[PDB]
Amino acid sequence: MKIGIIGAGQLARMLSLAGTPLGLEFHCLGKNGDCAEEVVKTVTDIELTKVNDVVAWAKQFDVITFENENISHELIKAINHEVSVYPSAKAIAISQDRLLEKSFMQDHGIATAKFVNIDSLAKLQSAVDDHGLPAILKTRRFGYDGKGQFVIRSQEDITKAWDVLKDAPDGLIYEAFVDFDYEVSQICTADLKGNIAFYPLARNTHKQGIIVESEAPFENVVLAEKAQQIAKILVKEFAYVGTLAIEFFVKGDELIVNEIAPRVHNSGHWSIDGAVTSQFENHVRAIAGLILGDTTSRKTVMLNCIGGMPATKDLAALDRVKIHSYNKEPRKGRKVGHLNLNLNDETDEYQLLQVKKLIALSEEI
Template sequence: MKVGILGGGQLARMLALAGHPLGIECVVLDPAPDACAHVAASHIVGAYEDRPSLEQLVRVADVVTYEFENVPAPSVRLLEEHLPVYPPSEALALSRDRLTEKELFRDLGIPVVPFVAVDSLEALREAVDALGLPALVKTRCLGYDGKGQVLLRSREEIPDAWEALGGAPAILEGFAEFSREISIVALRSRAGEIAFYPVSENTHQGGILHYSCSTDSDPRQREAEDMAGSLLERLGYVGILALELFDTPRGLVANEMAPRVHNTGHWTIEGAGVSQFENHLRAVAGLPLGDTSRKGHSGMVNFIGVAPAQEAVLKIPHSHYHSYGKAPRPGRKIGHGTICAPSRESLLRGLEYLRELAPLVR
């Protein structure tokens, strides 16, 4: 079985590594000749819009998936004419646009912050009148890791914010009062089997995920599962879906979803029965899903901008090192470390060491 992946970064790399034991070989399409998945996957070097490259992928792959949301829609359509593409393109289309994503959440009864679509400076002013301040203005598409968004604290900031986003179609979001950010990584098989990983609690710095933790049973587990489950069913989903949520005094509020394996699920490599990467492949390949239960207490720290030495990390009890084989660059995710410990206390102690070794370099 050959699984094609659009994108050859670290998510594709970890998928490819998880594939070989299953007898699944991955083929990535990525324009970068040094795409870091190449060490464990075949690599078609080509643009995501390049027809000959897409046709080559069709010839070699049995099924196609992707590691990022911003896959060009015409490319997905071309692939879909020849092969199954999972997760389904509707999930891709809806999640790529913050407006349609929030409308989907709302339609399914999943709580969201108040939001208004804005497509002009004037509309942004009116939206601020309607929602009040502070509020976040975000481009509808192509935002990630804190990019493509501006926090508005006063009306005077409106013109600069609009200019900073380049006048692209945008959305104004009211501000949620939340105590913490959590996420749930959910999955659905081709046969309709559904499973959920334990919720993880996430800490961002300047919009980039710094670290995630999954320890004792989370009081919001069931609530998060209900939300993610309704999305999986509504979309006829196949593969891993991550849902980021705010924990507020009035319950969970959905922030955004990602139709792919997710940074807040990296701890599952050591911390769960079967990792999100293997389970994503099992799902898209039509195999039975694997055990998502947590083994011990796990946490993950991203290596951003610079990676600590292996030796220093591996001296921490119960630690694991994940290099992505990427050159260091400020703000770039180039690896992560995981602690998978027998107790919450030893996890928290290990994470403290690990965070000291791996400060976020923007």
């Protein structure tokens, strides 16, 4: 069986690393010299606006998936008529636009921040009038790592936020500021028949809008049950196949959906070394029409390497640390790898402190 992946970045790289032992063959649409190239059969560089060329490429294979939900859902629909793509064009359309995403949650009784579509300064003033400060003005599309956002903390900031973000061609959303204690994510995988394999919750640490740490299992049965029930709604309504990621704000026993990603996600990277079947192996099993792997998990912390990464010789000296370099060119803010560590004892805690020392030296956000 041949699997095509739209994108040749680190998610594609890790999908192939996980799926290749299953005896599957991987092909990417992307740039030669992107980091998945050395671990897949072929990489083909086709401009995504050339729909017919993309469809022709995809038809060479048995099933297609993608690493970035910002791609055209109309493109996915065109491919999916000729060869299966998972997950769905609907999941892409909804997840890639903050307003559509929030409206979808609202329609299905799923809690989120209060939100308003913003198409003018007057509309923004009304939103602040209706829903209050503090608040965040965000681009509806293409935001990542907290980019394209302006936190409004005063009346004065309203005009300032509008002036900064008004020219976003795909529009803007007002979000009420959520007072939460911490953040967690639910990753799960759904197969062709709608069966879902759940991972435990992971608690995620952010700095300057970028995830820097993720730790699982976050043990809280009330929260886990709520997160699973939300995931079940999304899987059903999207007719979803593959790994799905849901990010939440937590306030006490209350879960508030922040956003979703219809793909393997940074907050599940711990599962490479902490679950019987990682989020990557399970995404591949799902789309390949295979039964999902067991997801029994053990305590694991994942640390991101942003803007740089410690020298391999220094990492290797911490002999329990599992190294995941993506072999990417370092640049400010760029995710170039991560480190996983199972946490069982004091030696593990020591190695974790050492990893943190090294990351402090290499990080550039």
